[PDB]
């Protein structure tokens, strides 16, 4: 039980429980890599446990150390391409996380003043199904 | 054999290979978080599969969201205050790992500035064996 809190946190197993499902719509395109970190790091600050960021096409487990590079239009996260619209599952209390990105002058500001739109939607089940890249130990073994 | 590397992963269980051993002496005391925090990352970078962080009386097994906050003689890694002398466990190829550690610019030349030294040990065989902590999940459940 100590072995799946662990694994959740590190992306290596899915996870589920209520959240909140979050789409970004940025027709300019105008949303950064700084504004989506923003909004990453505001829902970790507000306690989601699982964060998972998809395109139409894509899906990337969101860790403490992912990168978020590139230009609006195309966000590179944790090596996928993604452009836009985005959508953002979060497990967390759902209001919590919702509240979150309703912060005056919070986040969310971000996306808004570049022309975009976000939608959050509350949620009693959220899967967050992506797993971060895997690799096989070289060196390690078990003692 | 699958639950033996994602639990080595994770923190889980202890791990065994070859790899480094790495001393800081620090009289001043002048190291400071962002030094600890340059050598995580600098074995990190080499390919390090486990890395334990040890003073003369406690023991850290680093993971993805470990941090290190503090001042020099007092550095706190995930909760654990610690105090120079320290030795920082490392599983990977010994040489690369070694290699990481000499580049310059990085925390061994940190070190050095505030008058330390830092003592490196290639070794057929280190033994990490501190666990990870992981605090409860309050919504986040596996699949």
Redesign the interface.
């Known amino acids: 039980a100590?072995?799946?809190?662990?694994?959740?946190?590190?992306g290596?197993?899915?996870?589920?429980?209520?959240?909140v499902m979050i789409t970004i719509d940025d027709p300019g395109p105008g949303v950064a890599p700084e504004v989506m970190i923003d909004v990453i790091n505001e829902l970790r600050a507000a306690?989601a446990?699982?964060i998972q960021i998809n395109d139409a096409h894509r899906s990337v487990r969101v860790?403490?150390?992912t990168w978020v590079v590139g230009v609006p239009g195309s966000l590179t996260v944790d090596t996928k391409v993604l452009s836009p619209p985005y959508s953002i599952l979060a497990?967390?209390?759902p209001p919590t996380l919702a509240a979150a990105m309703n912060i005056p002058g919070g986040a969310q500001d971000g996306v808004k003043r570049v022309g975009g739109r976000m939608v959050v939607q509350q949620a009693d089940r959220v899967?967050?199904?992506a797993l971060r890249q895997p690799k096989?130990?070289?060196?390690?073994?078990?003692?």
């Open positions: 100590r072995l799946a809190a662990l694994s959740i946190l590190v290596a197993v899915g996870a589920t429980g209520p959240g306690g446990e699982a860790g403490v150390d497990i967390g209390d899967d967050v199904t096989q130990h070289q060196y390690a073994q078990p003692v």
